[PDB]
């Protein structure tokens, strides 16, 4: 545990009992916590309770931001318990619009990549937290992927954006993997997935189509797989695909069912945290739909 | 084709012959066309030729922006064909800094998602185009993905940022597809990809590995695939995976070769704009590595 000083601020190792007082200014704020992993803190005493817990986290370097005018805008640091550098930050609704979070985060990052001896850092930010993704982008964190999450106090799951910055980026990197499913009737498989997985055909070659691409998203680039028509008169040999989704399991499940897809659900909860059900294509392929809940 | 009216500007359906004169102020400007798809127009006549072509495009709904000062700062509108609604905009250098592009783009978008009857719009902006990424951010467009592109007049490829706004709200969507490769020797397959594709391990259930996950990226969430141990005279049907990569094809080619992987030979340029080579796994699975060049 060390100290960090920037061109304005001075980050100091968080002290639950000492900082719980100023920090509650953010943790007890609903508009600021309307973005955290749990609901806002009730009392500075509970905030204290929380704080001490976070520091406990193995390898959790957290600092209390101390602003240029004897004030404490908030917290910024690295989540411990991670097997790959996590970034955390939040300010009181007022310290907003000063570039504190950006400067404090950039500070923690800068430190982390060098003297901290990390090969890179990550920041998981919800899709709607524009103010946060803003901080992250300024700091040099770019989108590396995405994953669905679910906070217990939350009525439903949500989409997290995984942004990261490396000491030095890899010159080469695979942007995506598009797997091919040898299907008996492409034209039909497309109609199926378009309703069972809400996919859309990225493109269809042939009439009827003998090769196509199903975009599991409504956006140009993103998760998808291709469909290659096959002969026989044999069938094939099942391919297995795991689809990590966003949204409730049963919501998705209900989608699969309705579309008339052959399902091996309802959603069954699994010890690794997600709930799932398996769609089985006429040809035998098995698309496991996994969701946070 | 209708009219757009804003809290300052008035967007009017583009008129190649009428507006080509003013708009050439941008298309003829090299500093303004630096991020464009094509090089600047030599003459207001070429710009007119260019402009009519643009309008000809399928669903190309373009408007000439008219500023509250009897001036024409630039153009803004929706590109045609795209499939996934597209966004365009550019201003003459002298018209920069007045919030014109933001207002006019936010106009075209606001319109496009309602009375236009579109379910969403997308804007592909190069990573470097900070000034445009700024407008996009302001209009409410968020990063949905990224892809590598390559303009002819460009000496090389470049990163494209796909931002977007959905009038809709598809709650369910796939965040990733992780395919399973029935491999005879998991422990070793990991070694291979490890060096040939630069994969990283993450899973390793069983001793020795009977199921694993090869993260083709250093980042928590991202492209990857699973390895499932399979005995008997199988598999009989090899899996086909298409990996869209970043970097030059040969560069990647060398890696796979060096790694000692079995490649079908040097990178061949394909009609769809990528150069690729295939790695063939001992069990028959075919990994096609595709790069923009
Ligand atoms: C993230 C959060 C703290 C806000 O960050 P923020 O401090 O208000 O954003 P910054 O103040 O860091 O951004 C600086 C802004 O001020 C200006 N600014 C002034 N000085 C600046 C400087 N030195 N550097 C950068 N920007 C500066 C910029 O123009 C910038 O954009 P804006 O003016 O339009 O707001 C707040 O949304 C929050 O509490 N979120 C909950 C926590 C969370 O969800 N985290 C994500 C998961 S870890
Ligand atoms: C089209 C584009 C990017 C224009 O950028 P711009 O001129 O900065 O966009 P605006 O006109 O909305 O600029 C807004 C600026 O004016 C300011 N402004 C001044 N008066 C304003 C007013 N009354 N209302 C709103 N904003 C105002 C804003 O605060 C903002 O400050 P900033 O320059 O630091 O961002 C332009 O730079 C361009 O032609 N680029 C080349 C083509 C291209 O980038 N294409 C992208 C692929 S689609």
Automatic annotation (TrEMBL), chains A, B:
Keywords of this entry: Transferase
Binding sites annotated in the UniProt record for CoA 3: 91, 97-99, 101-102, 129, 131, 138
Gene Ontology MF terms: acyltransferase activity, transferring groups other than amino-acyl groups
Identification of the protein by name: Bleomycin acetyltransferase
Species, as recorded: Streptomyces verticillus
Binding site for CoA 1: 8, 89, 91, 97-99, 101-102, 129
Domain N-acetyltransferase: 9-168
Binding site for CoA 2: 89, 91, 96-97, 99-102, 129, 131, 138
Any coiled-coil regions, as ranges: none
Pfam short name (any one): Glyoxalase
Top-level lineage group: Bacteria
């Amino acid at each position: 545990t060390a100290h960090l000083r920037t061109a304005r601020l001075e980050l100091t190792p968080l002290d639950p009992a000492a900082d719980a007082r100023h920090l509650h200014h953010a943790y007890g704020d609903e508009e600021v916590m309307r973005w955290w992993t749990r609901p806002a803190c009730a009392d500075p005493a509970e905030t204290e309770r929380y704080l001490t817990s976070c520091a406990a986290a193995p390898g959790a370097r957290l600092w209390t931001i101390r602003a240029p005018d004897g004030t404490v805008p908030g917290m910024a640091g690295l989540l411990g318990g991670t097997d790959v550098p996590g970034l955390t930050w939040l300010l009181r609704r007022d310290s907003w619009g000063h570039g504190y979070a950006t400067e404090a985060a950039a500070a923690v990052v800068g430190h982390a990549l060098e003297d901290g001896g990390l090969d890179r850092v990550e920041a998981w930010i919800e899709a709607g937290n524009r103010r946060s993704l803003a901080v992250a982008a300024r700091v040099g964190l770019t989108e590396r992927a995405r994953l669905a999450q679910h906070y217990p106090h939350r009525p439903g799951p949500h989409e997290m954006v995984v942004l990261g910055k490396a000491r030095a980026e890899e010159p080469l990197t695979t942007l995506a993997v598009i797997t091919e499913l040898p299907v008996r009737d492409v034209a039909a498989t497309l109609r199926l997935v378009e309703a069972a997985l809400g996919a859309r055909t990225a493109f269809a070659i042939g009439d009827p189509p003998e090769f196509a691409e199903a975009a599991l998203t409504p956006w140009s680039a993103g998760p998808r797989f291709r469909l290659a028509a096959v002969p026989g008169p044999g069938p094939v040999e099942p391919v297995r695909l795991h689809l990590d989704a966003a949204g409730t399991a049963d919501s998705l499940h209900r989608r699969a069912v309705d579309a008339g897809a052959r399902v091996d659900g309802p959603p069954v909860r699994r010890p690794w945290g997600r709930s799932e059900f398996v769609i089985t294509l006429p040809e035998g392929h098995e698309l496991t739909v996994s969701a946070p809940v």
